[PDB]
Design a protein around this ligand. Structure first.
Ligand SMILES: *[C@@]1(O)O[C@H](CO)[C@@H](O)[C@H](O)[C@H]1NC(C)=O
Ligand SMILES: CC(=O)N[C@@H]1[C@@H](O)[C@H](O)[C@@H](CO)O[C@H]1O
Ligand SMILES: CC(=O)N[C@@H]1[C@@H](O)[C@H](O)[C@@H](CO)O[C@H]1O
Ligand SMILES: CC(=O)N[C@@H]1[C@@H](O)[C@H](O)[C@@H](CO)O[C@H]1O
Ligand SMILES: [Ca+2]
Ligand SMILES: [Ca+2]
Ligand SMILES: [Ca+2]
Ligand SMILES: [Ca+2]
Ligand SMILES: [Ca+2]
Ligand SMILES: [Ca+2]
Ligand SMILES: [Ca+2]
Ligand SMILES: [Ca+2]
Lengths: 132, 276, 263, 275, 275
């Protein structure tokens, strides 16, 4: 496989390598707070883990959309790749099992810590898009 | 540095913690202890403020950093409570008679109220949602509420006769009035000694705690019947001597300061979010 | 309905239905209860008129809100007949009636399957932990003696009614817990009382209790271990009774929310 | 906010709005101040009833416009209190109260951060141009004693109070400017006066000042090089007050384009405490 | 290997043992504590004989359950000595003895380790949060005089005893919290009192408290930010005291399910302050 793609690519013809669970995502584990205060008791934003070939994103809202318009809070998470993939087979499941238990998380600059005690609803109105 | 705008904050979940910084808070900030005026009567001293301030030096606070004030009772403290310094904690006795009035003071100082003036003579009044209350304080408040209809006629009241009005308060130093939300009302505040004020609550206050000295532990800080939470900064301790009450506060400064925080309004970053 | 047989599967990721709270208002009733002195301080004649105009703002129709009263906790508890769709009560806190407010809320908030008792002819034991004896009437004086295997009294005489061991003297409502397994001879005042053999089930969801006054005093269980506070054992503080009714009219969407229908 | 220290980036090709002015009128308040010598000439017990319907035809709803009243510039300077979201002030000019109009307009139109002063016990100084000693009360005479390096006095025996020199006399609002960097000693009559060590901030946004009659003469900046005329300083020539109140209600929108309601202070005070 | 602290490794697949709650009723003992006004209301002598038949139904033998009595909370708290395996004393609520009930449950529900004190020779200080000063006797009157780093009093003279601060007078049990880290001087009237310092190790497992009537007040932790309610705190409401006794005989499995054996009673705790 590798000596055939060595020769096709040396003449400028189209090549291709077939992978099983390719390491396309660099390791990243962080968060984003769209609403915060120094008490850290009314928050909103997303958390994610990108590692290997797996994305687990989870959005939270402490008020549970009590003052949102039509009681709906919108979330979004955009992951750019490094190389263009072709003909992928992707499994999508409606729960982030890693962001489901109570934990304490440091602040953005490492100053203080804040507490996150989740209960989990189902995701409403899911849309996954594949851009080029 | 971009005072008005809201901007999101990102940050990694793998970052080393900072130092302890509980010490440096004691070097800079202030502290106010409040007590009823009969506490100093049992103490029988004119140097016990000097005596306590020697004991706060052990826990890191400097000499001129801790301030002491007085009040007579919670009925006369509540005609004008204003909290000045950075951190403070108030001390109140338990009265079985003053059930609601302990809950009024713990409503007024533990939350944060955005307030607009009112004019009883000129307009007709209503409450918009669940966060709208009518806070009224003064020497002697007496409030009578005449609800109107969609044609501005009285419901149970005559809009000319003030006797057919409907009373919610009698000669109180402070009132927080909850009426039904969405109905125009007609009002009878005795404005010579009282001052009604259209208020609206934001998020609560972070720098004051309340120590309920003695009794049971009941305080309805909220407005509904269906819940009544007991937050972090309201607490209770038993008593026989007011010396032992004061020794417990001086010993456990580091826990009481930990339960409260700095007032988020007081910072620079709230410059157009209502407090520079 | 409810079914212990006949399993119901259902699924997930089905769409949430629309808010049916408004249709719940149009096809239901609501019945408030107040002690008699609450109507005394108000001293209006048409105060039932001026409240029904205010329930109409929140969506309740003009034929669904009913007002009933009682004298005190001692007189309401002779036979509480609660039969509206939704019910809430307003109990004024008395310090010495601390044991009677727990006995009423035990009777109101939970279901009870009851059975008669013949004091003259039979001997009665309690089988279950959830087996209790409820006696109502005008003046209940209950005297209990335990029993050995040989049908002989333990600390009493089965002939002499003076040597018995009483648990109640002249009370309108008594809930009696006795150790389980032992038979008993009873001696009650049957002329002004009616003791029965009731059995506890799950809670009643069409009733709710708003305590009006001092602190939480509610052990509606029988063991000393647990004393829970559920969704609808709530409490306020008062200075004027006319202010208390404004809070109930305003926050109907939270009081109706923590309770269910008869079905 | 927790995150002011980030940059914001916007394009120079985006689209405008539909002009959000009617949303400003419906969800805001307005408090116009006036001296008590208006209401004698006004001669009505329903002119608050009258004018509040004339604000309806501009877009303001009923329960939004409030009217409040003082008696002169002297008795308003004791405690200026701003209550609602918008505040326009009507004041009348004379020749004698010349400094006292610039004193009042400085405190109102600018934000201040005031600490208190224990003048009996300690010796105080001013650290740059931007702090002043703002004292207010019923009546207080202030006398100052500059000191040298060695705590000795210059031109003033530090024990005698009659050797001190005078800077105020029975004034309701005093803003003192002394030499920045010299330790002093004070003689405020503290029984009727509260002096405060206080620092200037950015200008207060929402409040506007309209003077009635007389020329445009106001010094807000402490230095004599600069005497600026900001966008919230106006003047109107008067003969009757009914022309004045009609002029304000007819040109509400020109005044709203200037004041910017984002700066409410949640309190009713005119300064900040040691916050 | 009596004093060595070796770890243990156990699996997560071991099958459970049998029920065991009917063997504990055979071997162990039980003690009841009631105020002496109980037997006044009972009007019986054979009620000790009566109830011992009722414990036999639930599984206890005839010689296991012991009955002890006291007069009031004040006189029981002079020296509470609790000897049997499982101890259950129910106290009566008093609105005025609110601190004295919670000082009793601080002793009983926890376990203290105590060192003696000599007031005449030495000056005392408390090292951390666990050090409290437990004094009990016929009449205890404790006076404190804090000292600086030079052995001089702060607000007190070390020669005059009237200037001393006062924390209690004429009680049967006093638990005293002072500022941790300051040398003090004491004035306990040790003719009828006996003070010794103690530090809290952990909870005393084999004893429960059943409050009889009244609201929920109890504060173990002499700490304002913490007032925990453990599982061995119970409250019931009373009208008669037969119904109290049928309740505790009925639910003996639930009283004993929430309290274990005393960890210091075992032969395991050999050199870890046994019993
Ligand atoms: C603190 O001294 O040390 C930390 C690492 O040991 C360091 O991150 C931080 O800068 C220091 N903070 C201060 C100023 O005390
Ligand atoms: C009033 C309301 O909430 N709107 C819903 C709407 O969302 C829904 O699509 C429609 C059909 O079910 O029924 C309406 O009642
Ligand atoms: C002149 C103008 O801008 N018109 C648009 C109007 O057509 C649009 O429907 C409205 C929606 O908010 O916004 C306005 O800005
Ligand atoms: C529950 C079970 O089957 N286990 C047995 C039990 O039946 C038996 O009574 C007991 C005697 O000690 O020994 C257990 O292992
Ligand atoms: Ca009426
Ligand atoms: Ca309301
Ligand atoms: Ca007997
Ligand atoms: Ca039973
Ligand atoms: Ca001179
Ligand atoms: Ca200067
Ligand atoms: Ca002294
Ligand atoms: Ca201590």
């Amino acid at each position: 496989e590798y000596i055939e793609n060595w020769n096709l690519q040396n003449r400028r013809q189209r090549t291709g390598f077939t992978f099983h669970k390719p390491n396309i995502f660099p390791y990243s584990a962080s968060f984003t707070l769209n609403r915060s205060q120094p008490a850290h008791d009314n928050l909103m934003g997303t958390m994610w883990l990108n590692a290997g070939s797996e994305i687990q994103v989870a959005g939270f809202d402490y008020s549970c959309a009590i003052n949102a318009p039509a009681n709906i809070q919108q979330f979004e998470h955009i992951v750019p790749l490094r190389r263009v993939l072709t003909t992928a087979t992707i499994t999508l499941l409606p729960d982030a099992e890693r962001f489901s238990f109570p934990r304490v998380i440091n602040s953005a600059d490492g100053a203080t810590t804040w507490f996150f005690n989740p209960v989990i609803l189902r995701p409403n109105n899911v849309e996954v898009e594949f851009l080029l | 540095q971009n005072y008005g705008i809201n901007l999101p904050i990102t940050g990694s979940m793998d970052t080393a913690y900072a130092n302890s910084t509980q010490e440096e808070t004691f070097l800079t900030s202030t502290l106010c202890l409040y007590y009823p005026t009969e506490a100093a009567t049992e103490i029988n001293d004119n140097s016990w403020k000097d005596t306590l301030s020697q004991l706060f030096l052990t826990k890191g606070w400097p000499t001129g950093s801790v301030y002491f004030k007085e009040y007579t009772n919670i009925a006369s403290f509540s005609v004008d409570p204003q909290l000045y310094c950075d951190y403070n904690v108030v001390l109140m006795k338990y009265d079985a008679t003053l059930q609601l009035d302990m809950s009024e003071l713990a409503d007024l100082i533990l939350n944060e109220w955005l307030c607009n003036p009112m004019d009883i003579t000129l307009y007709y009044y209503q409450q918009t949602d669940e966060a709208n209350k009518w806070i009224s304080m003064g020497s002697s408040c007496t409030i009578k509420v005449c609800p109107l209809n969609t044609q501005t006629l009285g419901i149970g009241c005559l809009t000319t006769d003030a006797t057919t009005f409907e009373e919610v308060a009698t000669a109180e130093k402070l009132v927080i009035t909850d009426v039904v939300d969405g109905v125009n009302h007609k009002l009878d505040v005795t404005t010579a000694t009282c001052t009604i004020r259209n208020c609206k609550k934001l998020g609560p206050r972070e720098n004051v705690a309340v120590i309920q000295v003695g009794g049971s532990d009941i305080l309805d800080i909220t407005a509904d019947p269906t819940t009544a939470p007991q937050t972090e900064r309201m607490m209770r301790i038993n008593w026989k001597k007011w010396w032992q009450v004061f020794y417990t506060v001086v010993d456990y400064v580091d826990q009481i300061i930990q339960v409260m925080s700095k007032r988020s309004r007081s910072l620079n970053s709230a410059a157009f979010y209502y407090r520079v």
